[PDB]
Design a protein around this ligand. Structure first.
Ligand SMILES: C[C@H](NC(=O)[C@@H](CO)NS(=O)(=O)Cc1ccccc1)C(=O)NCc1ccc(C(=N)N)cc1
Length: 247
């Protein structure tokens, strides 16, 4: 997250920290995610596409720090890694950048709700917030483009939704952004999501209720003028989410 503020997992109880195991013992951060149900975490497909091996992943819930333990945190293995079949990446755009991870503790249990672990509500069929509405993003991503390391503390910021019309302008992203995507940015282009924030949530207060409106997917640079962050439009993927979360 470029700009914004450092926060705690208590303020983002649905945030999942996804890591990958390596040959030896090293565990590096891969992407963010959101707990949509006790057994399911939703993230982005581009995070795992190059290494579809479920065994190499670890999902942490209730974690506020990148490389240190948090009180109340819970560790999970990946029981099932579901990538979207129609995923593809063009020059800039990442299409159908959405994924599901069925989690399970070593004891075979799913998540247990607490003050630091809670689910986030999914949107209704084609029911998105009006453009211009403020929404929040969370992640352990880069604080600056030039950084090669991620912040140790979880960060968050607020961005505003941009109309498909405005985002489809020539100096923005043109025809590269589709209706299955959402653009959001800071009106002053000071704060934004960045590398490392992928898979994390774009949460909007819809009718007095926190909703998982989008998933951090792509963008040209970070906090670059006229280059909004692009998010996977969750409301357009409800049929897919349901079909892959049953049995
Ligand atoms: C997977 C994805 N790839 C891209 O976005 C590619 C185009 O597909 N563009 S980029 O400009 O190379 C992303 C980037 C930004 C800054 C430095 C290096 C990479 C990626 O890096 N995803 C993370 C990401 C998410 C949001 C934003 C943003 N809000 N500006 C920027 C980056």
């Amino acid at each position: 997250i470029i700009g914004g503020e450092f926060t705690t997992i208590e303020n983002q109880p649905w945030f999942a920290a996804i890591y990958r195991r390596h040959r030896g013992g090293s565990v590096t951060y891969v992407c963010g995610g959101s707990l949509i149900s006790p057994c399911w975490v939703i993230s982005a497909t581009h995070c795992f596409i190059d290494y579809p091996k479920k065994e190499d992943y670890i999902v942490y819930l209730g974690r506020s720090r990148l490389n240190s333990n948090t009180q109340g945190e819970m560790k999970f293995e990946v029981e099932n890694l579901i990538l979207h079949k129609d995923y593809s990446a063009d020059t800039l755009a990442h299409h159908n950048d959405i994924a599901l991870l069925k989690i399970r503790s070593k004891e075979g249990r799913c998540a247990q709700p607490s003050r630091t672990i809670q689910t986030i509500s999914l949107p209704s069929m084609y029911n998105d917030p009006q453009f211009g509405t403020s929404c929040e993003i969370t992640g352990f991503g880069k604080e600056n483009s030039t950084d090669y390391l991620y912040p140790e503390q979880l960060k968050m910021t607020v961005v505003k939704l941009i109309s498909h019309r405005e985002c489809q302008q020539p100096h923005y992203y043109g025809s590269e952004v589709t209706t299955k995507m959402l653009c959001a940015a800071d009106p002053q282009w000071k704060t934004d999501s960045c590398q490392g924030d992928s898979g994390g949530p774009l949460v909007c207060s819809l009718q007095g209720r926190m909703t998982l409106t989008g998933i951090v997917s792509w963008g040209r640079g970070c906090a670059l003028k006229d280059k909004p962050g692009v998010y996977t439009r969750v409301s357009h993927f409800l049929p897919w989410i349901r079909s892959h979360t049953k049995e």
